Design a protein around this ligand. Structure first.
Ligand code: HEM
Ligand code: HEM
Ligand code: NA
Ligand code: NA
Lengths: 713, 713
């Protein structure tokens, strides 16, 4: 069946904005996951998980009689798809159970791990999500094997269809670098927003870069990919040595024995894949990665034996039974036990990427410290494992259950507690009038609140107006945010705040974060009034102000908007056309196509563009909230052509006279070009639409203001 | 960006079930188009349309100073994509403004037509849909040019994204037959459900079959394609001669002058396409089809000149200025006016497909009769134009506005008016008790009501339980409906009905159509009772019984289910795997994936399978409403393999012993294999899900029972 994508493969794709509708969701419209989870007997779930660890199923037998190593891998792959660039991937939506991640090569045999958990999922039903269960199981595996975890939060709601993510452009699984779709260029520069070295890997190649078993070069890939998943050197070493304290790899025979991944397998495989024709096809015969390495002398107990081996032997390049590069300890005794035969022992073995931890000089220092001081190792690993498995869950207000750690961590972008009475409706009316009386303009008010709120992204639930981080480094100096105009607006708002707070009794006060949003609300009200329409814009107080010392400046970098079509802004020249970047931003803000359309059309006539650009400002009454953008965009009396100097800027001239009426960008003109978006523009450009336009604009404005308000959830 | 479709191109696609969500719809969730339309000043819209006919725009000038011909083409193409096989296409969703149809080669320059209508659409806004406007404009073009139409109904709601339609498998526009994706095999047999001869045409090739200018062979294509759009010989001749009484074709120079279709054009074209480099690119220089034919001596007035010319000359094959085959009248004077130059006249010309109306023996007889009796021609064309433009609108209860014809037509599948008091709640309880006391089983009751209601399709809103056509030819004879079991159940229901109706006072009576649905509901209640649950099933009376004479047997054949996964039925072997056919049927029934899943699992345990097959009947308590199907389907203690005899039937055996537990088809097991469907099955197979399964089942059952109930809508 030939499709629109076939005929027009470069057309913009809006269907990413209409995922996760009530149609595809089996739960009722009123289902609340948090309310279900908060009644779960978590202690009972954990006891069930603890028993499951040592209850081997014959269809996929447990190594050493213990599934713990398998479940740790499962939970570290669930979390391990995360990219800091866009916040996409991670464990937060349980996406490992859908395409494509259910069938990535690096997730081979995790299908079996997830099937082992079905009887527990079934028992507890909607009270525990698959997304939560995947991570909980990893925690319980660690606990069962004598490791003390840092804690656990529930609250990851299940999703019901694949997330639309750019995983790269290669058309072959695990394709080595330098092909026609290479994810690398220059001196090994990995294209953003990717965080893995080959299509279908979690981070790096365990043999070494594109298969080359050099631990030093492997270390460069490890550091780069882990940084791109928000982990530094100490966290990276702790995680890799911590993980490889447990269990084993599987490569008993050649990879050509292994059949179709789950999405390609026959209907009779019932959701499983990688069926193997080698010997029994499982257990002692298992093939997963093709490597056959067992790290420690007690693979089912926490120890400091990984670093004892790493530093206590010299290592020789060798091959698994599948033909993959791996390393074996020169001259060592057989001290490592066998997974199934108590009469058999083995010499210590290592991956190329394990030896990276000793042969990269910076790693070596940390590894040595962890070797000599295993208590430091345990604490680092516990903290890293928590961060790994929670880094995409958003603010601490989303954390549920009885095991949530009390310590507040810097990477959580923490918001202080509110410890005073909030402002009421009369107060908010008073403060809006004061803001408007100050002389701040519609454009200043709307711009500033947009700048503060529009850093939110639903992918990892970072960003938003809560915290008032727009006043801090680095937000206050981002080019998009117009640092000098921003400073003058914040100065004026801070004086209003000081005067209001100074007059109160009984502890009542307003945060700057709330006042920034409320001021933006006053700007939108005033613009409606400028148009001849009285409206109230909803506002919910309760935000608090975070300090500079509670703000990690390096971590905040990835939230900078380098493309924001809502402010007609592009920081530099990109490969991806600007309209595709606009749809990407709308996806992160959680906007539908109709929401994106309304919002952009209003922002244009309110004066939100960076630098007061005239591009797309299709009105002769700026700072009035009207549907002018749409009426003027759709007027056939105007003809559009790209400029000589710049093919991405367009002039709109009267078709009869030739007079210049307007200019615009690709972001502006796409609403008059794309067949689906133009249909939406038509609704708001109709003669009957002014009331609808205003109401829908206020709604989507308020939605954006509240994106990070999980305290009200 | 590589996608799941790239990696696994033959995977099932569930996103066709979750199209048209509230997310993509710009209107509020309460918007009711009918209520908006009923307040439209239709007379005002028509005056504006009359004005527009002769208001030529410079950017695409009007032939002969009158856009009427262009708009009639526009309206006939809007309606002309309809296929009787699945009810898909037609005018009823305004889909000509979206991909792919906005950019089909046969729809070249209709973009110009639709843009000419924007000012009217804008003026009247949501009170007239594009879908209604395209057809009304065709009606007004006809009226402006002196032809009296049979009438017009509003009520086609606009849609906001492309419909998922199989238009064929060719990967080249207009590809001639016999290629690697040929829509033809054997003795020119067109694959169902297609209704056109080449990809991107409405019906047939105007030069002749695969470009061969033989009018006799072209006639075979015309008959076959028009039959597949529900039109017989009389209606087909009326429509083609009626249409081609107006306007002209356009092929003033070579097709290589014409640039990208609208979906491929540059952003600056603002939704238009086919920009031409030939001379002025438009008007006298226009190129659309490549043919250059003007049929009558008065192209902007209704006349009887089409058949005068067709019969009054002999015809000579020749070529247009673009090189396409067409026909010119031997020895004729230049009597046909020129569209732009009053000093120029032209000889009469015809398409290959026009000569088909004279050289096919069956058409010649009709054409002659129309020539000799022009008033018969006019009436037939008026009636056929109404049928063409309304054939996909469904029951007459959906028809809005003040121009709706009073005459009831056979192709509207008419249902008599109800002229008596309906049964009340007390009556319905009485009739349910009598049905249960008769001996009829859960399985019989559920099967029969399913059979009656599940003929509905949302594509053209035909079918459903209203009319009790299940008791008539041909429904009573269809294999899926189990003719002999069906006869015994209807006999019993008719005796209950006779006795209840004979006891009533006033005129109160129950229809068989209502009783069949009510009895189905009682079966569902009894099944819930068998399972230990107290359940009420909603029921709405008001269906009526249609007669055999109000039921066209040939038209009814396209509604026969040859595949119904919901009854585990496949009438023979098909190219498309059965699960794809299941999702296709769920789309026609307007079901989401969660609705499809719930429904299918319940029907299996209630005994709805054709022939009492055990396939998918995964319960030991048949005729009890439980979630057994899911709990057993997801049990890892069972292993599944295709049988020796039949690769589409599967045996489910105990994994430990090897004992046979169950058998199933692809339709059954896809719920345990497809990663999204399995996630749905898991919700319903959990330990907390029994009451959720029952309540969700009753909701979807009631939905299906009410799909055709536009009298209550
Ligand atoms: C450079 C980073 C990493 C590389 C290249 C790497 C590579 C691999 C490979 C190739 C396997 C064998 C899969 C099989 O054949 O069954 C594996 C196993 C495993 N990995 Fe890692 N890994 C890395 C980091 C991590 C981290 C961060 C953790 C958790 C904190 C982890 C935990 C494990 C565990 C527990 C297993 C054993 C699974 C079992 O017993 O069945 N790995 N690793
Ligand atoms: C065998 C069926 C038919 C074929 C092959 C056919 C073919 C065509 C072609 C090729 C054109 C010229 C397009 C252009 O170059 O601008 C055309 C024009 C048109 N057709 Fe037909 N047509 C058919 C049936 C119909 C029907 C059923 C109607 C309406 C009842 C219709 C009404 C028109 C009109 C009004 C035009 C003139 C357009 C104008 O003046 O701009 N045709 N047709
Ligand atoms: Na994420
Ligand atoms: Na249709």
């Amino acid at each position: 069946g030939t499709s629109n994508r076939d005929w027009w493969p470069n057309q913009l794709d809006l269907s990413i904005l209409h995922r996760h509708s009530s149609l595809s969701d089996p739960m009722g419209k009123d289902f609340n996951y948090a309310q279900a989870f908060e009644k779960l007997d978590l202690a009972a779930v954990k006891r069930d998980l603890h028993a499951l660890m040592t209850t081997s199923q014959d269809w996929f037998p447990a190594d050493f009689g213990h599934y713990g190593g398998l479940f740790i891998r499962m939970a570290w792959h669930s979390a391990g798809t995360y990219r800091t660039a866009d916040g996409r991937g991670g464990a937060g939506e349980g996406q490992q159970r859908f395409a494509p991640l259910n069938s990535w090569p690096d997730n081979a045999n995790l299908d079996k791990a997830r099937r082992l958990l079905w009887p527990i999922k079934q028992k507890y039903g909607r009270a525990i999500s698959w997304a939560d269960l995947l991570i909980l199981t990893g925690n319980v595996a660690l606990e069962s094997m004598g490791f003390k975890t840092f804690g656990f939060a529930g609250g990851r709601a299940d999703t019901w269809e694949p997330e639309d993510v750019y995983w790269g452009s290669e058309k072959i699984w695990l394709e080595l670098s330098g092909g026609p779709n290479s994810r690398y260029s220059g001196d090994r520069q990995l294209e953003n927003p990717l965080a893995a070295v080959q299509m279908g890997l979690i981070y790096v190649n365990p043999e070494g870069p594109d298969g080359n078993p050099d631990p030093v070069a492997a270390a460069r890939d490890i550091r780069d990919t882990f940084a791109r998943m928000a982990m530094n050197d100490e966290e990276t070493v702790a995680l890799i040595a911590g993980g490889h304290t447990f269990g084993k790899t599987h490569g008993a025979g050649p990879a050509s024995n292994v059949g179709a991944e789950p999405e390609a397998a026959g209907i009779e495989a019932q959701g499983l894949g990688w069926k193997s024709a080698y010997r029994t096809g499982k257990g002692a015969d298992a093939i997963t990665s093709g490597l056959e390495v067992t790290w420690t002398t007690t693979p089912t107990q926490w120890s400091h034996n990984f670093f004892e081996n790493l530093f206590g032997y010299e290592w020789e390049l060798t091959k698994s039974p599948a033909g993959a590069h791996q390393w074996v300890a020169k001259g060592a005794d057989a001290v490592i036990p066998d997974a199934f035969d108590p009469s058999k022992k083995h010499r210590p073995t290592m991956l190329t990427t394990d030896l990276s931890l000793r042969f990269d000089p910076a790693y070596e220092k940390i590894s040595r410290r962890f070797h000599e001081n295993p208590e430091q190792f345990a604490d680092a690993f516990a903290r890293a494992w928590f961060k790994l498995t929670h880094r995409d869950m958003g603010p601490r207000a989303r954390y549920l259950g009885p095991e949530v750690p009390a310590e507040v961590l810097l990477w959580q972008d923490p918001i202080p507690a509110v410890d005073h009475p909030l402002i009421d409706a009369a107060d908010a009316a008073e403060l809006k009038a004061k803001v408007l009386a100050s002389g701040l303009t519609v454009s200043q008010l709307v711009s500033t609140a947009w700048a503060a709120a529009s850093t939110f992204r639903g992918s990892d639930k970072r960003g938003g107006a809560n915290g008032a981080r727009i006043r801090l480094a680095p937000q206050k100096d981002w080019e998009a945010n117009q640092p000098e105009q921003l400073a003058a607006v914040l100065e004026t708002l801070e004086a209003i705040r000081t005067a209001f707070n100074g007059a109160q009794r009984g502890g009542k006060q307003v945060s700057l974060a709330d006042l920034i949003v409320l001021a933006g609300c006053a700007g939108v009200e005033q613009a409606a009034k400028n148009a001849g329409h009285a409206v109230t814009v909803p506002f919910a107080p309760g935000r608090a102000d975070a300090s500079q010392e509670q703000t990690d400046v390096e971590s905040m970098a990835v939230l900078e908007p380098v493309a924001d079509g809502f402010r007609n802004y592009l920081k530099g020249k990109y490969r991806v056309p600007a309209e595709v970047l606009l749809v990407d931003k709308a996806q992160l803000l959680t906007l539908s196509a109709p929401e994106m359309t309304v919002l952009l059309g209003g922002l244009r006539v309110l004066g939100a563009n960076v630098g007061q650009s005239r591009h797309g400002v299709f009105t002769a009454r700026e700072q009035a909230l009207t549907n002018d953008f749409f009426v003027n965009l759709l007027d056939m009396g105007t003809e559009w052509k790209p400029t000589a100097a710049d093919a991405d800027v367009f002039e709109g001239r009267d078709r009869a006279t030739g007079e210049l009426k307007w200019t615009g960008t690709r972001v502006d003109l796409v609403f008059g070009s794309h067949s689906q978006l133009r249909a939406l523009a038509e609704v708001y450009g109709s003669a009957d639409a002014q009331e609808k336009f205003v109401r829908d604009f206020v709604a989507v404005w308020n939605k954006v203001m509240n994106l990070d308000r999980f305290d009200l959830a």
